[PDB]
């Protein structure tokens, strides 16, 4: 009974408006097929779906990468298998070649063919490549990404395999083999004669090969060869040049000989620490509880270890370091007596030094071996070796008690005894002695055999190469099995995660068709009731009778 | 008969007003489709509908959660199946390798592949994940919400599965396999404490393991192991028992220690040459340029080296040896002064001897090493080794400068530095040090591996590991079926509750359309009767006749 200013059709319109959102959402949900289409839905679901999608894509790419790794491992394994076949053939040839019934032509032919197959192995090692990467040319590792998160990879170990790595660097089966050596040749013994015969046997004559006097450098090599020997010398370069003390003993412990000397170097620091005309050395000086780092050059200015800081000596009565003192300029000469008075130390890397008075007392010097030999090659010394004492006085073998053996220094010359029957034996009694032989190198070596230039133990070396290649092949096989397992895992995981993500997205149409029917029926009923509502007002017109 | 002041239409308007509310309610109900739209209807019904709606939504979301739990269980089960297959292959390989017809190379290959697959098991254990959650990395539990009200959950048990948990920590069938060692374990360092920190770093504390003082016998094996060392000792058995001279130095050259001593053994030959109570030793005596062979027993009769010839000492004025002399009987005491006066030698195999006066001068003695060690185990000596000097005074490590390292004697004790972060390093600066480890043996070795003898009953251990993983698989299966049953129950319950809530809301349209029709018809009737009511009054105007 009101003029449309309180009409009830507004309620119907509002209800239709409330329905329209559900209608639109239902139709759109049918169209997409995914429950979550924008942030208006459960945004947490959207984020979880996005994370799941990223995981699934990364997992699939990782699976493809693992397959690629399997392929590269397969190529490498095939190459290794044929290399193994070649090595087995070479071993078979070597087994053939060991028989003594073969002429030098036969051995040469076998060597030619073996060299051919070794070059074949080298070639196939260099040749094999997989997409610009040489599998067998370098001892690297290859990382295979099979996981979604960074840092999770599988490593394939690759070794450089060739003739050098497998060994034998030229198998060389064709060298001149086992050869019998020639006899004693009594006439060749032109050494010093002596009928001493300490056993008194009338039928033996002792021959000594003199002129084997070792040189001084030989003495130095002998002492340097062994570790832990003793050498006493005077008149050394740098330290010991005044030679106030003679017994230094140089304390050879592990490496280039050390030393120990009393107050002798006071002015020799520049000569020692600066071998050349412009050398400068780092050193550490402390007064006691005050560790300061300094540079020493030609016994001149004690330049501070800073970039360009220059230290000045000051503090008369204390004699410490200060960059900004107000007295005379610092030099090594006076700081020597300063340290002697204050009982400090100036120890450096190549020698720990202290002073009492006006001269440095060396403690733990360490002179270079080559320089030491160059300095004392022509002076007197009593260098000793294990359980032996050797004397040298301004000339090699002053006492004439050092003799050069085959390769070692001995106090006794090579003694050769000549027997009555023309043989030469190392000892008087023929029951012992191992009658000496001659041949192919001189020096009258006491063996019946000359070294054969062929490979020493060919079969063992070839079996070692076979073992190496088979270990490599086993490594590749284990890696291949592990990658196959990784692929199976990653497939199962990506399937499960795909279903998981499907449970969050991907709205069930079974519910959505019924929801659409709801929305459409409500919309139709609402529009019709809106019509029925707006057909009401004209009753007031009917009342007016106009 | 009244002019609108007692109007008869008022009841008509009032009745139309009453029915208008019903008409509007019917139209609105038809538009919405729900029986209750606001509190004007049965409010208790509205509250009940709200509660049912909340319950239905909660149950649906719980069903989705249950599905997610099923998916994660499936992924875990797949990973466990892969691990189980790997373990089966390990068992098969172990059964193969138990046979005694195999060489060390075959065992090496088998152990290599077993180790490879064990590392594969560990990798698949570590890298398996479900949406940022590692199922097999911890012994945790995951709660799945399947109910509408808080606290109603289902728990899934997860166990940490890896090579450590299953046991055997390196299956190690071949031998010389590797097991991981433990960490620094700062708390175990019970050695002597020293905050000295020579580098001055505040955060470093130096710990030294004291009580590592080597015994004197340890020094003896230390000196004896190396060849050519120096040992200075007095108060020795036999030679040096009077200890007239102290600096012997024992001249170790190649083997059991030698010696060099002045005239001290004059009467000590009987004890020294005859360690037991009746021993006899052969000897060679020469009065110069002319050798004679003799036997010595307890300094008594100088029996000739013949079968039974007995030598007596003779020749006053020359002091010769005659097997047919004509003077008094021979004793070593008398021949001692004979040789001392006449400058002869009695050099033997185990010692070169001469005498001047009435006492023998030893030159090239050779004492047995074991007898030496037993003799000087509890006396003062200053034995030295390569470039080192050691002092002992009536007791092991008198100077307290001897410390027993891992296997060698060093002048410095074992130095361990503990870092601020709880790590223990061999050096103060963390850049170096090779952070120390422990494990399986103590002694704090700087190794990541400690050996382990193969196993006891390998197949039993593999079987127990299989049983563990199989039990885990069964547990996951029981839980997974649990969740399937829960999903079925939730679906049935939410369907029933949805049908329940629908029966309270959702007004029957069958009665509602009839209500609309009745309201509309009665409304038109009311409007028309209102018009007819308004058509009545003008009969009074008809009365007025104007």
Author numbering:
A (entry chain B), B (entry chain A): 3 to 548
Wording from the paper:
The rotating flagellar filament primarily functions as a propeller, acting as an Archimedean screw, and supercoiling of the filament is essential as rotations of a straight filament do not generate thrust. Here, we show the atomic cryo-electron microscopy structures for flagellar filaments from enterohemorrhagic Escherichia coli O157:H7, enteropathogenic E. coli O127:H6, Achromobacter, and Sinorhizobium meliloti, where the outer domains dimerize or tetramerize to form either a sheath or a screw-like surface. A shared feature in all four structures is the formation of symmetrical homodimers between the outer domains of flagellin subunits, with one outer domain rotated 180° relative to the other. These symmetrical dimers are the result of outer domains being able to adopt either an “up” or “down” conformation.
A 6.7 Å resolution volume was reconstructed asymmetrically where all flagellin subunits could be fitted into the density. Analysis of this low-resolution structure revealed the seam, which involves the lack of D2 dimer formation between two flagellin subunits. This seam is a consequence of a reduction of symmetry along the 9-start helices of a flagellar filament composed of dimeric flagellin such as EHEC H7. The two outer domain subunits in the seam still form Sn:Sn + 22 dimers in domain D4. However, rather than forming an Sn:Sn + 6 or Sn:Sn + 11 dimer in domain D2, the two-seam subunits form Sn:Sn + 5 dimers with each other similar to those forming the EHEC H7 and the Achromobacter ODSs. In the non-helical perturbation model, subunit pairing introduced a seam causing a discontinuity in the helical lattice, much as such a seam or discontinuity exists in microtubules.
